[PDB]
């Protein structure tokens, strides 16, 4: 599907993903340094039979920010689409939610965007 | 337009707005206590000739969180629609952005939603 492989955002974070025949996404999200301490599990889904009209391929994934080294009590979803071609990209918007008390719910969820490319920034 | 007047969110914050003939929104956003220290200017726009098919009326507004008492170096936009009837409401999603250094841009913008009614929670 052209999705499988290593992707880099413009801050130089990386994730590696396997797109399954079935529509499964599985892999790992890491800081650009790539040490164990900054790797986290990533699971999601994608449209495994996209349009052939030049549309992108819709996907999303989640990372819970807990590994064997660290727990940020939070989780980020990226929602977006894969766009193929000589300059493939994955264009995304994300929601980072932290666990809060009900008082602090107002500040629970950050929003932002990421463009992933096959080559580093 | 049924928009002019006092609205209350489910946390009991309030804003008072005047909808102008021209599409202008002007007024004040306050904490439920309503003291001067928690009042802020609000300006926005609305669709002054909405559909008559039972659609809502689109609007939005901004509050910069600076008054004579306080500066939170931040600003919130509410984007949504006004829905008339015996139980009028304004259904909204909001973006709260704080001024940050470029390092801290990731945490610059919170997202959430508000339902405003004519009666308090």
């Amino acid at each position: 599907a052209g999705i499988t492989g290593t992707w880099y955002n413009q801050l130089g974070s990386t994730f590696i993903v396997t797109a399954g025949a079935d529509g499964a996404l599985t892999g790992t999200y890491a800081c650009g340094r790539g040490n164990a301490e900054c790797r986290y599990v990533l699971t999601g889904r994608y449209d495994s039979a996209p349009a052939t009209d030049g549309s992108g391929t819709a996907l999303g994934w989640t990372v819970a920010w807990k590994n064997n080294y660290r727990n940020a009590h939070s989780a980020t979803t990226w929602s977006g689409q894969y766009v193929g071609g000589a300059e493939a990209r994955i264009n995304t918007q994300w929601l980072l939610t932290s666990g809060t008390t009900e008082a602090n719910a107002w500040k629970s969820t950050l929003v932002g965007h990421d463009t992933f490319t096959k080559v580093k920034p | 337009a049924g928009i002019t007047g006092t609205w209350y969110n489910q946390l009991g914050s309030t804003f008072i707005v005047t909808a102008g003939a021209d599409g202008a929104l002007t007024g004040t956003y306050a904490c439920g206590r309503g003291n001067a220290e928690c009042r802020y200017v609000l300006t926005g726009r609305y669709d002054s000739a909405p559909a008559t098919d039972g659609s809502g009326t689109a609007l939005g507004w901004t509050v910069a969180w600076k008054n004579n008492y306080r500066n939170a170096h931040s600003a919130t936009t509410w984007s949504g629609q006004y829905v008339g009837g015996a139980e009028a409401r304004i259904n909204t999603q909001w973006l709260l952005t704080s001024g940050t250094t470029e390092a801290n841009a990731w945490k610059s913008t919170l997202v959430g939603h508000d339902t405003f009614t004519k009666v308090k929670p």
Partner: peptide
């Protein structure tokens, strides 16, 4: 800081 953005 947060691991989504740490170097």
């Amino acid at each position: 800081s947060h691991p989504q953005f740490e170097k």
